[PDB]
Amino acid sequence: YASFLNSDGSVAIHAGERLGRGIVTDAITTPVVNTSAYFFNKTSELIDFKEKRRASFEYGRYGNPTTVVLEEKISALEGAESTLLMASGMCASTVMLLALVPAGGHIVTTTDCYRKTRIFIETILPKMGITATVIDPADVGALELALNQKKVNLFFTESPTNPFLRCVDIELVSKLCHEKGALVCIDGTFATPLNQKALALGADLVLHSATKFLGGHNDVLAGCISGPLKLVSEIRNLHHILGGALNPNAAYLIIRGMKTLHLRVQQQNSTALRMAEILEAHPKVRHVYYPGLQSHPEHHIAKKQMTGFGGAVSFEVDGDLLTTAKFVDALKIPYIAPSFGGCESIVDQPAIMSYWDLSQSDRAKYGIMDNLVRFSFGVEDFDDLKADILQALDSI
Amino acid sequence: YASFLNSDGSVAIHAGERLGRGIVTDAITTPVVNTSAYFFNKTSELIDFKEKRRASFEYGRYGNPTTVVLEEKISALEGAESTLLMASGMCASTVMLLALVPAGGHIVTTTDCYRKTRIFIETILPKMGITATVIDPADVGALELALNQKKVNLFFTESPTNPFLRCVDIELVSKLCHEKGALVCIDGTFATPLNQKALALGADLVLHSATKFLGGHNDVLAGCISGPLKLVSEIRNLHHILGGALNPNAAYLIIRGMKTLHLRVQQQNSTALRMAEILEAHPKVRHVYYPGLQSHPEHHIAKKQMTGFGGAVSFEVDGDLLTTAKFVDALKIPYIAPSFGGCESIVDQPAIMSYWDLSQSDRAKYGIMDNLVRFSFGVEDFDDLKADILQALDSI
Amino acid sequence: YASFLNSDGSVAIHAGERLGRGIVTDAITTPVVNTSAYFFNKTSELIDFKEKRRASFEYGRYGNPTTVVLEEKISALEGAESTLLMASGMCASTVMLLALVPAGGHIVTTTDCYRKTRIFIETILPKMGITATVIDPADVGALELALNQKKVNLFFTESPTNPFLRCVDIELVSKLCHEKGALVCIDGTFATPLNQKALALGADLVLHSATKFLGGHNDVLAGCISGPLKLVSEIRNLHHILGGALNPNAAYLIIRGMKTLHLRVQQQNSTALRMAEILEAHPKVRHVYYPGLQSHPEHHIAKKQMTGFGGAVSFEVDGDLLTTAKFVDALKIPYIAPSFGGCESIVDQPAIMSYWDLSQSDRAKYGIMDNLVRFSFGVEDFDDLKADILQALDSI
Amino acid sequence: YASFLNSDGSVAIHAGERLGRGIVTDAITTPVVNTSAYFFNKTSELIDFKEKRRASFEYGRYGNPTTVVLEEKISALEGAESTLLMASGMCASTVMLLALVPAGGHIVTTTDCYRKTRIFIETILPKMGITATVIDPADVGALELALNQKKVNLFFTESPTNPFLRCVDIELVSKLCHEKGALVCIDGTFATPLNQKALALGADLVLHSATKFLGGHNDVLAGCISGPLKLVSEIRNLHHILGGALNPNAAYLIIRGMKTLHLRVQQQNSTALRMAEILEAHPKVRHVYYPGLQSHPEHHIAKKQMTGFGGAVSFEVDGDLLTTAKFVDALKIPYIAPSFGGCESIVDQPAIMSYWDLSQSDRAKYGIMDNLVRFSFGVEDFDDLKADILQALDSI
Numbered sequence A, B, C, D: 001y002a003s004f005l006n007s008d009g010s011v012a013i014h015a016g017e018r019l020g021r022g023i024v025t026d027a028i029t030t031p032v033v034n035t036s037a038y039f040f041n042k043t044s045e046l047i048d049f050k051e052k053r054r055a056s057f058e059y060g061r062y063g064n065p066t067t068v069v070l071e072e073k074i075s076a077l078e079g080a081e082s083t084l085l086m087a088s089g090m091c092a093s094t095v096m097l098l099a100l101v102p103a104g105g106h107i108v109t110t111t112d113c114y115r116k117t118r119i120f121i122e123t124i125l126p127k128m129g130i131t132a133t134v135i136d137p138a139d140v141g142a143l144e145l146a147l148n149q150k151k152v153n154l155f156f157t158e159s160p161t162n163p164f165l166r167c168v169d170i171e172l173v174s175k176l177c178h179e180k181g182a183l184v185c186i187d188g189t190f191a192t193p194l195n196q197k198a199l200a201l202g203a204d205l206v207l208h209s210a211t212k213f214l215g216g217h218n219d220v221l222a223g224c225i226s227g228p229l230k231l232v233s234e235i236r237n238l239h240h241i242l243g244g245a246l247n248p249n250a251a252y253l254i255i256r257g258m259k260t261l262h263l264r265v266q267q268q269n270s271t272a273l274r275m276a277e278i279l280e281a282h283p284k285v286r287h288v289y290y291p292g293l294q295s296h297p298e299h300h301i302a303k304k305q306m307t308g309f310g311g312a313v314s315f316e317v318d319g320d321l322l323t324t325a326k327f328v329d330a331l332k333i334p335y336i337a338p339s340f341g342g343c344e345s346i347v348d349q350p351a352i353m354s355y356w357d358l359s360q361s362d363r364a365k366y367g368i369m370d371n372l373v374r375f376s377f378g379v380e381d382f383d384d385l386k387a388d389i390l391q392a393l394d395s396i
């Protein structure tokens, strides 16, 4: 974006605003445009726009002035060519898949894929004849193999993963894929464009869930997809049809929340790391998952491709479904709810929160244990948070 | 909804508010809830919810207090069992189709189908092996024939139609379809739940584009699908995956706009009718399309299943692409833009506005003429509008 | 404003938007500008603005792009030279008084003055030595007398009045006051800029409470003051110091609500009138107050300076505090609350609602009877409303 | 507030929300309540509320659910008994002055008082016979003298001061005042409830300007007044008449902004201090103002009653009106505008920005030099900022 703006924090603030907005004003902030359509002065100009000689969104489903600002902002952060914003993260992945993978094509992902996204790939895509290969996050051989057996169209995965924060060597993975013509998409939701530049490491596309860290206030939903124009534009087209447009009000709520992205992330990164160690050393804590820890499987990877390790920390308590529940019920600061990344701390038992519909055996079939607890550290003072977590574990 | 409320106008105002809200308040209006998730007091309760013993949206993608109000509101008007709201009309149709029509299945629609909706059906659905039969809005024999030849899954169409406002005998069409097991979905955007009750006439589902008349202020987009629970719920499920959630801020903007629905519709209904006749009798106007006119192909049907004929009026000027434009360029009150149904009057040349990408020949291939002009009468004073249209016509 | 615009309805919609906004956009609606300050490109320009060579609001407390629109909009309706918008109606009257009336000066108002306003004039102004003469709305002799005895600075009153909707011959009163140099300010809240033009009748300043009819949806508070520049500017200056600025989000909610002012007012005007007569003829109704009725004291004046008679109707039930309450408690459509002018209907007993702090004797000291009931007719269907009122009247 | 939260940061986040809201929900954030009035179920209950047996706001001008949350939140931070929120900072001071000081009373303030506030005290208050004594911020003897000569009603001042960030020994000043029965009001705007607790130091009332640091995003205006109930309630009463109510939307924007108050403040405190030194050592900088420096007149006081020194830094460049301007015109990150405290950095020449109307002689008569430059450090990265300031300093 700007030369005088070299830090990501400065970018997250003035990116797409300080130098101009396209919607002129002497105001410091971006104006919210609540319009469903855009007019033209005369039929002559309408034709001009229709003939690529003029610029206009024409209709609200094809864009919005207050929305593009956030599109450019995130684009600068990720250092992408273009960024597309949708109603939600799910909408982003969904549309992207439906737009890039052709019928009958093949897809490759990890076993730790977000549940809902797994369902979409195992129940909807097959309808278009799309087949998929599910490998382990670390199993690079499996990827290389599948890369040769069938013709892979695109390798999709998130890093860190949910809920075990498993990381993928983006640089490597990308190289293997591009070697066989496969595409690579990374869901850096947990990471944040501040803790890692998936695009700079080789990924073709990087999508986020503004609902989490980008918004950071737990009050709005949004989808994010950044990458090269040639690509992002293909998705944008299908988007203009499926109509999963983001409301201008929401767009501003995110622009606003991003003004303090770096500040929030910085604090969440510490509290998370510091509390992880404390938890790891705790006698009542059986296992702790965090890329920052030395005990993490891909700790060497995370350390090589990340500058931070996120504010999300998962760990298994030394008890059972009931005891573990007793622990979370004891906390007093975090909310017992889904989602994560907001100023307010949140806790939940993935076993109950997102897999209660399955049987204990089917649950265990995929790592989720009644022991697993996912803590999303807010922005509250460390001491207050630490004391709370400890006070809770005591009752166990 | 209420017994003391026997009129749609009264309903559109208090339906889903006067009796209760689920979100208690001594406030007259519905509170906007800007949240991404919902918390639980204790693991115990969380389980209860998961075991269908307690109620909660859990996550913002699965619902919202300020959104269900609008959902119940619209459900009362259409006299439906349940209503689902999306980010936009296109999202509504799109999701509904992907959810109800199975792979390899067959679909039936009209030739006047909304352009973008046509594209989705002719380029995306085929990927799932879904084939379609396109018939003329009036050709009931074609429908009956198709109903017997191939196994029709669902008959989709809008009524009135765009831009020639063609109408379908909903009652009849429903009968034929249901006889063969087909589903019927009517797009009553142009109509409005006030001018007709597609659900009462026999349709299974009725969808709208709150972006138009329901909102009425040209400042927000939204999708609408009302129908039986068994059906609408199936859609809601795929919706929870595709993630086309509607923002609470937008949901309120619609709730508010609907408070004056009946009043707006009433006025537009008149302005349109009166202006249509005046236009028809005008020497410079070659043809006029409006269900309210006796010259309309299905005026008899419109008169039998409608109480109003919308505020949209299409007509052909006595000139060419250039002359017609000169007419619209002379208008001073309406805006030259897409969309319709807002308090502000709008005008456009479908030919240019939504078919400029096609050749003159390919355009004529489907009724669109450089002569056609679609007028969306706002809520301005009739005399002011009439005088403007006349003064303008006085130039061609 | 516009030449092609000759009807208030059309004006209330496009006034201050259709021709230009000062904040350029190809958007149909007015954009919301959420800013606390406005920047300058270079010290040179800042100086220009300070030297009155350039335009700018500088600070949010001094103006806002999305607010002026509303200022100009209302200015057109009242045909005023300039309009000022504040936080609330009380804010407007308050600031206006403090600004125009000098210390030790004298004021003249009616006995039916709005309570709160009465308190301000009887407890605050005296601190600045400002004395006041209170006369009866109709007593023109008293006004003329006071006009000669003391040196009146400004005559302030509302018309219709609350809650007895008393009217004042603006034309006459204005004439008498201007003869002695006194200023005249009318509070046309109940009337609405559609039902009467106080400015055209001779008044110097006309103020409203957008909170009521202008907003029309019972979801925002705002003040209104329209009149000559020389005058309104003087108020604006004190405003910039007392800081009762109006939030941009609020300004838009009103701009939006006004797009259907004429439509709403039209409907309320009828329902009110019709329901007034029905009520008058009812055996259980002792008295009914409404300028539209022939039994109203200033019906001849109302009939001469108004085109409508508002949507507010006051009447006394044939019972007591307890009985009358039983009546309002029987209603099902209207809300038991203060305020009026919104789409939703509202009822209340001034006695209890705004005079419960006074003794029965002190209450009757100024017309308020435990009998009095103020009905604010919403926009719901007449039949639904009528049936409701009549039904609850069969339980007395 | 809470016993498990002892840090201000955690307080600024959950204060007034984590334990309850008064407006029940399972939502994590506070709901925005857009309503002008509040209803009652039956006349019986209406009476209960009027007789202090039930709770209700009755009318929007008297309170709002989404507003009180902010009232209680700031109350916790300041450790006050109650907080009142208005439309703007000016409103707060103005109303607090008109409510606490009686007619003919005496007031005491400093020479560095906020300009607009000075005007109000020097032009409006005298109309009520209220006289004032202006002393120098440091001059304690003057205060002690004035405290004995005339009968001081209230001593009002800010600390730090604008623009020379002069500080006042709150503890001391409080003692002398209370000894003679005077009241003490501190405008801790520049300080922020995080850097100092004027209330705990002895102040009777501490008022802010949420428009600055509290909101921290330069997109909303708001006034703050915290202190004991007996006192704050007296103001709230006059407030209910002057009608400077705060819009719920604005209230939410602050509640949200305060979620990252500590984070923002923390960063701004550093940058400012660090840059303050570098600037002081700079050869082109003649003088620097900042309570954090050892060169500041009341650095010993600042150090004893503050934990931070604000993000505002004033300094004089080695040049003239024209040269100084050249420097600000060279900057690229901060905006040239009024206000301060937001994420975005801002700069201005008080001489031009707020004193251009006065003569060079009249300006200097009160310290304002054509040299003075007030820098409001945003939240951008220090390095980026530092480099910018330096770069524009070499242009000189």
Ligand SMILES: *Cc1c(COP(=O)(O)O)cnc(C)c1O
Residues within 6 Å of the ligand: A088, A089, A090, A091, A114, A158, A162, A187, A189, A190, A209, A210, A211, A212, A221, A222, B061, B243
């Ligand atoms: C948040 C999230 C999503 C989906 O985001 P929505 O906002 O719910 O649409 C998908 N994947 C991961 C890994 C997430 O954390």
Ligand SMILES: *Cc1c(COP(=O)(O)O)cnc(C)c1O
Residues within 6 Å of the ligand: A061, A243, B088, B089, B090, B091, B114, B117, B158, B162, B187, B189, B190, B209, B210, B211, B212, B221, B222
């Ligand atoms: C407006 C409209 C749609 C699509 O609405 P969106 O709000 O753009 O999704 C579909 N069909 C018809 C007939 C419409 O008029």
Ligand SMILES: *Cc1c(COP(=O)(O)O)cnc(C)c1O
Residues within 6 Å of the ligand: C087, C088, C089, C090, C091, C114, C158, C162, C187, C189, C190, C209, C210, C211, C212, C221, C222, D061, D243
């Ligand atoms: C509504 C009203 C006011 C004050 O309006 P607010 O919105 O409460 O500030 C003053 N006078 C009359 C006659 C009103 O009806």
Ligand SMILES: *Cc1c(COP(=O)(O)O)cnc(C)c1O
Residues within 6 Å of the ligand: C061, C243, D088, D089, D090, D091, D114, D117, D158, D162, D187, D189, D190, D209, D211, D212, D221, D222
């Ligand atoms: C910002 C400020 C005020 C007034 O704030 P407004 O938002 O302009 O009302 C008063 N005093 C000081 C010292 C301020 O910094």
Ligand SMILES: O=C(O)c1ncccc1CP(=O)(O)O
Residues within 6 Å of the ligand: A115, A116, A338, A339, A340, A348, A350, A353, A354, A355, B059
């Ligand atoms: O708890 C979760 O796993 C989660 N994470 C992110 C977004 C939403 C959720 C909730 P779920 O999938 O159970 O519907």
Ligand SMILES: O=C(O)c1ncccc1CP(=O)(O)O
Residues within 6 Å of the ligand: A059, B115, B116, B337, B338, B339, B340, B348, B350, B353, B354, B355
């Ligand atoms: O102009 C139209 O046909 C129209 N109508 C309704 C909604 C949106 C549009 C614009 P588009 O060309 O992109 O289809």
Ligand SMILES: O=C(O)c1ncccc1CP(=O)(O)O
Residues within 6 Å of the ligand: C115, C116, C338, C339, C340, C348, C350, C353, C354, D058, D059
């Ligand atoms: O009921 C009323 O008198 C009324 N009217 C208009 C606005 C507000 C009110 C309520 P209050 O008693 O507080 O003055």
Ligand SMILES: O=C(O)c1ncccc1CP(=O)(O)O
Residues within 6 Å of the ligand: C058, C059, D115, D116, D337, D338, D339, D340, D348, D353, D354
């Ligand atoms: O620049 C200022 O002095 C300032 N400070 C705080 C709030 C507002 C301002 C702008 P003004 O010139 O009008 O006083």
